[PDB]
Design a protein around this nucleic acid. Structure first.
Lengths: 97, 119, 133, 214, 51
RNA sequence: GUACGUGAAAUUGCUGAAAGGGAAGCAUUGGAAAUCAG
RNA sequence: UUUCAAUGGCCCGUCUUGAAACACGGACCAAGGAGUCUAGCAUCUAUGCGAGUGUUUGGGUGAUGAAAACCCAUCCGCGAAAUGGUGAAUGCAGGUGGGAACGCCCUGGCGUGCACCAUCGACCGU
RNA sequence: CUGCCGAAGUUUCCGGAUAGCAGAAACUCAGAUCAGUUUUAUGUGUAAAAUGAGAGUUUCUAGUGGGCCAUUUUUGGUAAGCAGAACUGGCGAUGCGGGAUGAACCGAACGUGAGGUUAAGGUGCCGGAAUGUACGCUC
RNA sequence: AGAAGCUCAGACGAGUAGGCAGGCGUGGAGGUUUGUGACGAAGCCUUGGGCGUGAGCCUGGGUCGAACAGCCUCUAGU
């Protein structure tokens, strides 16, 4: 406001390829909370599917540890260490065209 | 304790005597060569915080009370508990009917009126 | 800074409460808390629930029942999945952090509740947030 | 209730004994010096009195037109104002200081009455970086109890005789704020004291000046 | 405490407070009451009244 | 009273009071005269 | 308030210079009259939320004024990953020292040790 | 409108970045370090007692980058002036007492007042204060 | 105990560039004062009084004839 301006007090003083990246530690966070309660920590024959393309991510990177629960990761691209950690956690990677 | 004022004369703006366009309301001189800002001899004095009066007697009239502006009988009632501290001063736009009502109520309450004999 | 620029009435109430506690006790904790309440938001960075979980069970761990105290926001850390039991007192909790701590863990506390529980700061861990920003 | 009254009463008697002891010491020291001088004169011998370990310095020139080298020394002497008097431990490290601020200060040997009157009238202590008047012995006791100084008489003794804790006592005393001399200075005041002025060393005439300033 | 400063020299009561010894001082003592020994060496007098 | 609501200052005339031997205004302390306040 | 007496009192602004003086401005009074609005960027502070955040392009809706308030589908902006295609806990997401704060003791000792800073260390900046 | 803090007045490198002076924010430090200072010791410089003061850093952000006058040393001097450096001062941001009057001379540095006492300079009168005291010189 | 407050003690006070803080006044807006007003609002005048260090504020009297203000916030062609 003009009233609080300090010129009110000077009166009188003479004056590429689109590819957002997601790391492994956030892969389970993308999935909703009720599915995590169902699939995470339980040895179920059916595994959850995390299509990281539908969540606005182009590539899955390898930062972080995944929990030992297997999970199917559907994506376009994946860093070489990321899918190493994925099968070490028991999951598989399905590259999406 | 009595009321003593460090000064009685008002502070006049410089050369307000000489010029009718220059009002007597104080204005601090910004002139670099202003001998009056430099505090030369014979020149008039400038407002200083050293002229501030006693805290315990500031805002107090000669009688020792503080003037309080009053518009109606409701305002006077607010001065019931401070009749030895505040003196009621009826506003200048209060009609003659409300003047006499305010004065009577303050007199009954024991509250001083500064300008009672008016209108 | 003798007073905070915040006009929040409840922040002023906390400052009043810890003004008394700082001067009527001999706790360097209470003096520290009063100073951090005066500090601006720039100097009160958020601390994550994961860093709190780390600093409790770090090195020799020995967290026991010690209550974590931070003058700031305890933001959640969604990367960590299984949340331990924690007792934190803070200015604010993000809705995620408060929900996660309560569901699987201990309790959340405000700074007035902590002053009742531990007026002298006994068995309290005073944790700051990373200012590297 | 009774414990504090008894302790303070015993403390009061203890101070009286110390003051009595100090008074006898001054009388004996003066008398023995007179006897030594008398015996020297009778034998034809010459007796040299000891050097004065104590000096009293009064700043006689103001804060205007003073060289920076001389200004710093008066800052170190706490002579930050005109007509300010302080006690200095007169030694080889001080003689050189006072010799270069000769035109700006005067100093001399203060007798017991000068020290006794100064602390009684102008005595102010530096308590928590404040100028508190020495109006009662407990003020000195709480501020100099580590050095076994309990009363004004103890403080006077520690200053007059230049005891082991003279530095602490002199630093405790806020510089005395003396008035302008009663009767005035000499006609020309900034000439050297020897040459008819009022500046520099003056030996036993610092007393005659100080009594004017009190 | 200590609203006014009272000079102990001009206040007999304040002097008693500060110095619990002024009640017994005996300022003046008569010590020159024996045969006054005129102590001045003859050689000293010659040196004094020299030239 | 149409030279029209309110009627400021500059400026001008009259009356009253006072001052004035080649400036004046101003400031400080009081007196005198006038006028107020408690 | 006016006036007298004693004492004091050089015309204000601007400009130039180390500084004045000069050099302009000023017959008098009233009214008007000069760092404003906006776009971007950056600092600091406050506020809301916080790995998120941002309703107001637009749609819904709003009977009492409906250009307000209210509600939000899909996108999008910045942030969450850097480096020059690839793309990060080796090691409690690493040890040593100082350190806020706390605890146990009989000032000091011991333990714990945030922020930050020097240190050996890693991983593709973390 | 009042109050508080308060400079630079110029190096060092290419109009500037820098430093310096002034502030703010955040740190650690009181069995600690500083200093327009003096002693002591070693050979003017170096190192360790006196006295005073709480002493440090990091970030960042304003203003300043002139001159004048004077002292001392010194370089030449020259009809005689002066000219060239350095030096720290004084002014500059600053009123007041005195010097009859005054940018640079002697004192003194400032909130509003009462009382007391002085500085520099003065005490025949203007003019506050001895037509004081003592000894000389001068027409 | 308007802790924003109350109280005790000491020191300090020129100040350009610059820095920082608190206040005064004006037009209009939201709220509020059971607010003022033709028994006289606003304005104006006055050798009337009071308050404030100051910007300014309140008031007596006169004149005048229809609107106006205090506090808390907002705003600026202040």
């Amino acid at each position: 406001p003009t009233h609080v301006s300090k010129t009110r007090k000077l009166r009188g003083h003479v004056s590429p390829l689109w590819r957002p990246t997601v790391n492994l530690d956030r892969l389970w966070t993308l999935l909703p909370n009720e599915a995590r309660d169902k699939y995470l920590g339980k040895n179920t024959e059916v595994a959850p599917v995390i299509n990281v393309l539908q969540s606005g991510y182009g590539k899955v990177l390898g930062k972080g540890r995944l929990p030992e629960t297997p999970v199917i990761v559907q994506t376009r691209y994946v860093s070489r260490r990321a899918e190493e950690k994925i099968k070490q956690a028991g999951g598989v990677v399905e590259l999406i065209a | 304790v009595n009321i003593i004022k460090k000064r009685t004369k008002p502070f006049k703006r410089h050369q307000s005597d000489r010029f009718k366009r220059v009002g007597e309301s104080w204005r601090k001189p910004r002139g670099i060569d202003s001998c009056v800002r430099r505090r030369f001899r014979g020149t008039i004095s400038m407002p200083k915080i050293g002229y501030g009066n006693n805290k315990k007697t500031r805002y107090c009239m000669p009688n020792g009370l503080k003037a309080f502006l009053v518009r109606n009988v409701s305002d006077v009632e607010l001065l019931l508990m401070h009749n030895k501290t505040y003196a009621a001063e009826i506003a200048g736009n209060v009609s003659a009917r409300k003047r006499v009502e305010i004065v009577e109520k303050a007199r009954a309450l024991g509250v001083k009126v500064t300008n009672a004999g008016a209108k | 800074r003798s007073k905070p620029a915040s006009e929040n009435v409840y922040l002023k109430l906390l400052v009043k409460l810890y003004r008394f506690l700082a001067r009527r006790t001999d706790s360097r904790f209470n003096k520290a808390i009063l100073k951090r309440l005066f500090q601006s938001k720039t100097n009160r960075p958020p601390i994550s629930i994961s860093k709190i979980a780390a600093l409790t069970s770090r090195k020799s761990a020995s967290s026991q029942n010690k209550t974590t105290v931070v003058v700031g926001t305890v933001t959640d850390d969604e990367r960590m999945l299984t949340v331990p039991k924690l007792s934190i007192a803070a200015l604010r909790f993000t809705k995620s952090a408060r929900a996660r701590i309560l569901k699987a863990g201990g309790e959340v506390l405000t700074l007035d509740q902590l002053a009742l529980r531990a007026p002298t700061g006994s068995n309290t861990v005073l944790v700051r947030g990373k200012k590297h920003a | 209730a009774a414990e504090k009254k008894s302790a303070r009463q015993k403390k009061r008697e203890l101070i009286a004994k110390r003051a009595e002891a100090y008074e006898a010491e001054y009388r004996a020291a003066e008398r023995e010096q007179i006897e030594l001088a008398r015996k020297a004169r009778a034998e034809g011998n010459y007796f040299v009195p000891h050097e004065p370990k104590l000096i009293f310095v009064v700043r006689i020139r103001g804060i205007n037109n003073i060289p920076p080298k001389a200004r710093k020394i008066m800052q170190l002497l706490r002579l930050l104002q005109i007509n300010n008097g302080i006690f200095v431990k007169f030694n080889k490290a001080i003689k050189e200081m006072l010799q270069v601020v000769e035109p700006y200060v005067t100093y001399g040997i203060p007798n017991h009455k000068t020290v006794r009157e100064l602390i009684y009238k102008r005595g102010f202590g530096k308590v928590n970086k404040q100028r508190i008047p020495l109006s009662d012995n407990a003020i000195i006791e709480a501020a100099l109890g580590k050095y076994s100084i309990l009363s004004v008489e103890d403080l006077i003794h520690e200053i007059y005789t230049v005891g082991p804790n003279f530095k602490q006592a002199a630093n405790f005393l806020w510089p005395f704020k003396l008035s302008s001399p009663l009767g005035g200075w000499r006609e020309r005041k900034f000439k050297h004291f020897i040459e008819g002025g009022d500046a520099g060393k003056r030996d036993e005439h610092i007393n005659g000046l100080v009594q004017k300033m009190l | 405490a200590h609203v006014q400063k009272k000079n102990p020299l001009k206040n007999k009561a304040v002097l008693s407070r500060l110095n619990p010894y002024a009640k017994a001082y005996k300022a003046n003592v008569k010590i020159n009451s024996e045969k006054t020994p005129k102590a001045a060496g003859e050689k000293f007098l010659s040196v004094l009244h020299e030239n």
